[PDB]
Amino acid sequence: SSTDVQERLRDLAREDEAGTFNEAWNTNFKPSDEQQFSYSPTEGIVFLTPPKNVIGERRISQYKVNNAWATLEGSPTEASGTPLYAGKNVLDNSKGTMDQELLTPEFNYTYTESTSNTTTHGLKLGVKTTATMKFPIAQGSMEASTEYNFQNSSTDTKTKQVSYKSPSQKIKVPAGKTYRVLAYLNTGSISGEANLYANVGGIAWRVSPGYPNGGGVNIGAVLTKCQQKGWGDFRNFQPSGRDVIVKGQGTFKSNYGTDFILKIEDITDSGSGTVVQEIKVPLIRTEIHHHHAHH
Ligand code: NA
Ligand SMILES: [Sm+3]
Ligand SMILES: [Sm+3]
């Protein structure tokens, strides 16, 4: 969905216009640029004819996007992926007479991290508007980010190929034993929601009892009045002094490696063998290649 911000600010001016005359004259005028009439129990048939001075584009002047930003919304949902086999090596103490502490090789995996977002409730602001949102990943241990385009249905996908590495581990291998070390990359994903915000300025133009040819008041004050009165639906607008803040929404998701698990098997009797030990190993991350796209 999309909010046409400029058109909604024009309707904001029309709401204040009609609502204020309805109080003044007990009429039932609707927000409109068209001439309309209404029967007042205290006044008779009354006419509302907005002049060319205020109609259409001239309902708002000094319209400006002042700032735009995006913030994490709620608690993202993290999940664990299927572990990915990374390789294996042998720790051979079959000919040794002493127990040894033997260092494993480093294991590695070439992984494509992906971050994507979708603008689900867009803001049509009259100018290309973007904002970057940051979120924690991997149970709060790293920070990631994603750039929203505020137009409805905008999608972004960013990928990085990275190399994950497990540091060498020290394994006790008893005399005469042969051990096998198998390595697996653990993965995770995250998804969540973003709030999209724009602070916009402007002056709303209405005919009114005090200004029968039209007068202008900042949109922040006009919105404050209209929300207090119940004139029109501006549920995703908030006053901010003379300006208003308008809110949209997006989604995001991301995937990444989390760590390595090493599985130690006794293969002395020769062919999988008994698992003797498992080790969680923190990975070392090195970026190789990156690619950006927007749809
Ligand atoms: Na409208
Ligand atoms: Sm909320
Ligand atoms: Sm939520």
Numbering used by the authors: 24 to 293, 300 to 324
How does the study describe this entry?
Mpp75Aa1.1 (formerly known as Cry75Aa1.1), discovered by mining the genome of Brevibacillus laterosporus, provides effective control of WCR larvae when expressed in transgenic maize. Bioinformatic analysis identified that Mpp75Aa1.1 belongs to the aerolysin-like superfamily of bacterial beta-pore forming proteins (β-PFPs) found across all kingdoms of life. More specifically, the Pfam (Protein family) database classification indicates that it is a member of the ETX_MTX2 sub-family of β-PFPs. The Mpp75Aa1.1 is processed at its carboxyl-terminus by WCR midgut proteases, forms an oligomer, and specifically interacts with putative membrane-associated binding partners on the midgut apical microvilli to cause cellular tissue damage resulting in insect death.
The crystal structure of Mpp75Aa1.1 was solved at 1.94 Å resolution using the SAD heavy atom phasing method from a crystal briefly soaked in samarium acetate. The protein crystallized in tetragonal crystal lattice of space group P4322 with one molecule in the asymmetric unit. The Mpp75Aa1.1 structure revealed an overall elongated shape with approximate dimensions of 112 Å x 26 Å x 22 Å with a high prevalence of β-strands. The molecule is composed of three structural domains. Domain II, at the center of Mpp75Aa1.1, is characterized by a set of anti-parallel β-strands running longitudinal across two-thirds of the Mpp75Aa1.1 structure, and a two-stranded anti-parallel β-hairpin (β9 and β10) which amino acid constituents are amphipathic, with alternating hydrophobic and hydrophilic residues. Domain III, localized at the tail-end of Mpp75Aa1.1, contains a carboxyl terminal peptide (CTP), β-strands β18, β19, and β20 (β20 corresponds to an introduced histidine tag). Domains II-III adopts a topology representing the conserved structural core of the aerolysin-like proteins. We observed a more extended C-terminal peptide that encircles parts of domain II of Mpp75Aa1.1 via hydrogen bonded interactions between β17 and β18 as well as β20 and β11 (excluding the his-tag residues), whereas ETX has a C-terminal peptide that folds back on itself, thereby reducing the extent of the interactions with the adjacent domain II β-strands. Furthermore, the Mpp75Aa1.1 structure also revealed that WCR-specificity is likely conferred by three domain I residues in the β14 (W206), β15 (G217) strands as well as in the connecting unstructured loop (Y212), which are located at a different part of domain I.
